[PDB]
Amino acid sequence: SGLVPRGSHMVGLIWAQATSGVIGRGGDIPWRLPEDQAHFREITMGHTIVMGRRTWDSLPAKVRPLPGRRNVVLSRQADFMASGAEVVGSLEEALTSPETWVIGGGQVYALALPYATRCEVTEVDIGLPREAGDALAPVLDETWRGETGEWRFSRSGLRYRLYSYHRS
Ligand SMILES: NC(=O)c1ccc[n+]([C@@H]2O[C@H](COP(=O)([O-])OP(=O)(O)OC[C@H]3O[C@@H](n4cnc5c(N)ncnc54)[C@H](OP(=O)(O)O)[C@@H]3O)[C@@H](O)[C@H]2O)c1
Ligand SMILES: CCc1nc(N)nc(N)c1OCCCOc1ccccc1N1CCC(C(=O)O)CC1
């Protein structure tokens, strides 16, 4: 289950959420957590990362494409271009690698969920209620089985915990 044969197409989702399920607001993530940034890099490095066009927009121009990973951006706009990366019009076109991490945002998590067999979640204990127009984490049905870590404490003074979910 843990090994990925090279002829397969494994799809995982990775996200960080507040306890309310908020993942994004106003084109940004409404907190910063260094431990989550390190965790995201550790999981995704060396693999293909797939993101929605609005998540590409949310990365500073100087930092994208993200290093050490093949960057794929989803857009329906025939004139949207992502310098340094590949833009495709569907998840089917994006999922050609043996191991793909979908890195957001809310629309693309919902789109990719039917094909995903792993989710890696960071939950931040920050009280941020859901507001209209927020991007939200996908909801996971009972086909998913999860492990929840104990609450840990960030150098930034926020509690956080990690979840790992899997399905067949
Ligand atoms: N906390 C986290 O872990 C995390 C991670 C990533 C992002 N974020 C945040 O989440 C927010 C962005 O999320 P979002 O839901 O607004 O947008 P998104 O999922 O990042 O991108 C949505 C865009 O993807 C394209 N798209 C969607 N469905 C498609 C399909 N079926 N085929 C092809 N292209 C498709 C469209 O691009 P076009 O409009 O160009 O057609 C659409 O506008 C930001 O606030 C960002 O900072 C948070
Ligand atoms: C790190 C945020 C994050 N967390 C988990 N758990 N899942 C995700 N999908 C996810 O969003 C990745 C795309 C947005 O990124 C950022 C947003 C705000 C601050 C920092 C970052 N990043 C730090 C690492 C860097 C890199 O890895 O090069 C890319 C930029």
Side-chain angles (χ1 to χ4, degrees), residues 1-2 4-144 146-168:
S1 302
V4 180
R6 308 325 289 167
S8 69
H9 297 91
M10 178 275 162
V11 178
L13 318 189
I14 181 163
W15 74 87
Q17 62 177 68
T19 50
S20 62
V22 171
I23 66 168
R25 176 175 302 172
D28 196 2
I29 300 180
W31 66 84
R32 292 291 184 273
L33 198 82
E35 291 82 357
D36 176 63
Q37 300 180 197
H39 176 68
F40 172 81
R41 290 185 190 261
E42 296 287 327
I43 292 178
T44 62
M45 207 52 57
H47 307 299
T48 295
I49 58 177
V50 164
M51 73 198 82
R53 188 271 295 169
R54 297 179 189 253
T55 291
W56 173 268
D57 285 346
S58 79
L59 300 169
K62 68 184 168 190
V63 311
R64 62 199 189 190
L66 302 185
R69 286 150 292 184
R70 171 185 174 228
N71 283 227
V72 179
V73 185
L74 306 175
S75 179
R76 310 191 187 86
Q77 301 182 88
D79 49 5
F80 171 78
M81 308 178 198
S83 171
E86 298 165 63
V87 181
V88 303
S90 70
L91 198 55
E92 292 74 22
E93 196 176 348
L95 297 181
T96 54
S97 299
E99 302 180 59
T100 303
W101 286 93
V102 173
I103 69 158
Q107 293 183 32
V108 174
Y109 293 131
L111 177 71
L113 194 64
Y115 305 101
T117 50
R118 182 173 174 190
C119 293
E120 294 292 341
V121 186
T122 305
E123 181 166 57
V124 182
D125 194 17
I126 188 171
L128 292 181
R130 293 188 302 267
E131 299 189 5
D134 282 353
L136 308 177
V139 290
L140 303 187
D141 65 34
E142 65 300 322
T143 68
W144 290 92
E147 321 164 61
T148 304
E150 77 286 350
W151 285 113
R152 299 185 195 176
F153 197 48
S154 171
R155 180 185 63 195
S156 68
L158 286 163
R159 303 200 310 165
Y160 71 100
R161 57 181 171 190
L162 303 180
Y163 299 72
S164 299
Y165 292 91
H166 298 82
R167 66 170 175 172
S168 300

